[PDB]
Amino acid sequence: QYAPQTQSGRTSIVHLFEWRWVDIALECERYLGPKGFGGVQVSPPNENVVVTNPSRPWWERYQPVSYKLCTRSGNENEFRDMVTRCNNVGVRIYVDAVINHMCGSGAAAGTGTTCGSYCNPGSREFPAVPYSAWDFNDGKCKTASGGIESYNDPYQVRDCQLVGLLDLALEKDYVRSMIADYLNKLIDIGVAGFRIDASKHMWPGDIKAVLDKLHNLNTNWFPAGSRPFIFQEVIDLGGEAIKSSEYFGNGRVTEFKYGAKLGTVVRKWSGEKMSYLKNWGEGWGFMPSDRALVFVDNHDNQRGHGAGGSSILTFWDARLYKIAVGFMLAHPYGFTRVMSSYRWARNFVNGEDVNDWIGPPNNNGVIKEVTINADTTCGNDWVCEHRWREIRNMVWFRNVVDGEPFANWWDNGSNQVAFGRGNRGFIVFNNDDWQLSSTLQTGLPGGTYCDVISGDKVGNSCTGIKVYVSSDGTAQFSISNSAEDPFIAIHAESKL
Numbered sequence: 001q002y003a004p005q006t007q008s009g010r011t012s013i014v015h016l017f018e019w020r021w022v023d024i025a026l027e028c029e030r031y032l033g034p035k036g037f038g039g040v041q042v043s044p045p046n047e048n049v050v051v052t053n054p055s056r057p058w059w060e061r062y063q064p065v066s067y068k069l070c071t072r073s074g075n076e077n078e079f080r081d082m083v084t085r086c087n088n089v090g091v092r093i094y095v096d097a098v099i100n101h102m103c104g105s106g107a108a109a110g111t112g113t114t115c116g117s118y119c120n121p122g123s124r125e126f127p128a129v130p131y132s133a134w135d136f137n138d139g140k141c142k143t144a145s146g147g148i149e150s151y152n153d154p155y156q157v158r159d160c161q162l163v164g165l166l167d168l169a170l171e172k173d174y175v176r177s178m179i180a181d182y183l184n185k186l187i188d189i190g191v192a193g194f195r196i197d198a199s200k201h202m203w204p205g206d207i208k209a210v211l212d213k214l215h216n217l218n219t220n221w222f223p224a225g226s227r228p229f230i231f232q233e234v235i236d237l238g239g240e241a242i243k244s245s246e247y248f249g250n251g252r253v254t255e256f257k258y259g260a261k262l263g264t265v266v267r268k269w270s271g272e273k274m275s276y277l278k279n280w281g282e283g284w285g286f287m288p289s290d291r292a293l294v295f296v297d298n299h300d301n302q303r304g305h306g307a308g309g310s311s312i313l314t315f316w317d318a319r320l321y322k323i324a325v326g327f328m329l330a331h332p333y334g335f336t337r338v339m340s341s342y343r344w345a346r347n348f349v350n351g352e353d354v355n356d357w358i359g360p361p362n363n364n365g366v367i368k369e370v371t372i373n374a375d376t377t378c379g380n381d382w383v384c385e386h387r388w389r390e391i392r393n394m395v396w397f398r399n400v401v402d403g404e405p406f407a408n409w410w411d412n413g414s415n416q417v418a419f420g421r422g423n424r425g426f427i428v429f430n431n432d433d434w435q436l437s438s439t440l441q442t443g444l445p446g447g448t449y450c451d452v453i454s455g456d457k458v459g460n461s462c463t464g465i466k467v468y469v470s471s472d473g474t475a476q477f478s479i480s481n482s483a484e485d486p487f488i489a490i491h492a493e494s495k496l
């Protein structure tokens, strides 16, 4: 459950948020495969309710009505084709499994669903599954409202309705089996693992029961006896009754402290400095490295949802975002997930975006295709952070230094730091309001390396900055605080 099952040498997964199956299949072949990306986390592939007020929000996909593979991203046919095509080029697929609940209890009854299935929230009727009134936790919840009123009581967090969503009775074998059969269909198609949505709102034991029913991965792409990769979404910043450690037995867990603290450090808030990152990882109170799935931002907190947080860095703060993502990709802690989003019109009232509901680019409800420009960026308001040179090259950097020890740390006692990974990679950051000029020991063999942040190695030359490492391992670095990207990264494969 802890092994990502990526093709050997690939160390990151990318969340292609709200992307259509056909677009992801193409992306795997023309980009993700050749550029060394390990996998793709897809939006929920199961049928959801249609929300017209507001107009098709991204969150309607977190209100399941059935387990039919029929959404705005595509149908079963297109989903199977995407999985097959991506697996054939060495890119895995990870499914966002929404299994804690169904649709909103106060939703209207009818066929206003992405595939035409009927449902009646009031009577707890889901014919397409099928689920009935006794497949839910209505009588199990003890709050006056029926919803989660306090996060200091583990019972109501797991047995009550999360934002009015009908809570499934996961202790029942009927429910456990229905969910397992849905997940097994996905595994048989070729999916490598799952992101278990709202794991915090389910009992660790119930999740384990579902996981014990899962088949081994498809032998057409995976070795015999391969178990699906599992990463549970558990928001734990401390101070609450539920802890991330309660879920360690099922598989990996999302470490939300990672992005919250990294963001604070890079923004230089609350007296934090980059020099403090020397003991980054478990030294900062994070879960064990082999149990964590790390990321700077996710689909929720980049727009104030989930636990939110003001320190969270997103594409909106591009310069700092690249620094944070670059640090994450270079550091050995955890398994890394890169975010890929779409842009929406923000409207801040009282320091909060009220347009955080806006769904993916669309033409009257139909999600727009991902167009690729001449400079390799995306059109139609798809941000495609995974295509930014600075990010794609750091994804490659992580592959090159996989398994290498954290080494040769240096800092100026403020916000200028540098470190290497064995004798295969080195990175230097300048997050101070003044210039950086030092001769650092890189731990790398002598020669001329291409900086992969400002450019690329093309043939026997570099398109960006060139760094010369003398015979003893030292190299002079000069980074201005006004530089577009205030950090340099060189590795064994960028050497001329």
Ligand SMILES: CO[C@H]1O[C@H](CO)[C@@H](S[C@H]2O[C@H](CO)[C@@H](SC)[C@H](O)[C@H]2O)[C@H](O)[C@H]1O
Pocket: 059, 060, 061, 062, 063, 103, 104, 105, 106, 107, 163, 164, 165, 305, 306
């Ligand atoms: C899981 O959280 C994300 O999805 C939910 C569900 O779509 C929304 S809440 C959303 O739906 C509920 C239930 O119908 C109503 S009533 C409380 C609410 O007004 C809607 O916003 C959540 O915002 C997402 O983060």
Ligand SMILES: OC[C@H]1O[C@H](S[C@H]2[C@H](O)[C@@H](O)[C@@H](S)O[C@@H]2CO)[C@H](O)[C@@H](O)[C@@H]1O
Pocket: 151, 162, 163, 198, 200, 235, 236, 240, 300, 305, 306, 307, 308
């Ligand atoms: O609103 C949808 C989300 O609701 C909560 S996020 C929740 C967090 O878990 C708590 O630790 C504190 S920060 O309050 C937060 C806001 O209610 C669920 O955990 C999410 O999974 C869900 O998506």
Ligand SMILES: OC[C@H]1O[C@H](S[C@H]2[C@H](O)[C@@H](O)[C@@H](S)O[C@@H]2CO)[C@H](O)[C@@H](O)[C@@H]1O
Pocket: 318, 319, 375, 376, 377, 387, 388, 389, 390
């Ligand atoms: O590899 C494609 C391009 O990637 C980025 S452009 C990127 C920029 O770095 C970010 O700060 C904001 S402005 O988004 C931009 C994409 O719209 C490189 O800087 C480019 O040189 C490169 O062409």
Ligand SMILES: [Ca+2]
Pocket: 100, 157, 158, 159, 160, 167, 168, 201, 202
């Ligand atoms: Ca629950």
Ligand SMILES: [Cl-]
Pocket: 233, 254, 298
């Ligand atoms: Cl997540």
Ligand SMILES: [Hg+2]
Pocket: 049, 064, 065, 103, 104, 107, 119, 120, 121
């Ligand atoms: Hg419904």
